Amino acid sequence: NKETDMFFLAISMVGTDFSMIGQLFPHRARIEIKNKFKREEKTNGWRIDKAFQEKRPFDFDFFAHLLQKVLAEEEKRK
């Protein structure tokens, strides 16, 4: 679940720039980004619209830090 929530936060802050999202994700490749988009769009059309409206700050340091923290916390708890 948290991976999809982070992916949705990314589409909020940066838009459908699949390349940069793939670059900032630890492992995910571009084709995986596209496949996730194709699978999610059907049920989350409203959520991607919200993302496009939600022009959230795309800070580098803050996003890297929260990525690392939440990834570590999920990996610990899962």
Binding site: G15, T16, D17, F18, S19, E41, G45, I48, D49, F52, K55
Partner: protein, 178 residues
Amino acid sequence: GPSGIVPQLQNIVSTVNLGCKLDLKTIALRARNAEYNPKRFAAVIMRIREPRTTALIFSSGKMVCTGAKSEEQSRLAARKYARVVQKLGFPAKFLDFKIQNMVGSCDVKFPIRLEGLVLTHQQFSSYEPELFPGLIYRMIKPRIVLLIFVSGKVVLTGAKVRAEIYEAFENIYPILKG
């Protein structure tokens, strides 16, 4: 005659000339759906949900769009991209819109023995399961290429208008049947 199954288009391809110089970095910076990775390729990719299409910008003043379900829908997508480019501050225009390719698919609801299709029509039908299960079929009237499969479904590509795909299906149906 027709069996009541009408071929349905799944993709269109079209292009248009913007008529002005553009900066790929500026587009990537100012647009939300724009994607730009110059290290890989010198073009910007655009995505919109209505129409469901993907398109590209080029600095020389060119635009291409694809993924639509109809040529009119492809034109709508291209004009929406042109409007986006215009409001981003570029003096773009919608000049020389051209439909390039459209794909279709259909079915006949009975099996097609590809062995028979090749051994009756080796001159323009190529059959080679190992690398590709389907049979590859090219045609002259109109200049279309098809993929025919065991289940009887057929993929049609290379057309400029739905009439070509329809008449191609009508031409191949008596071959598919027998």
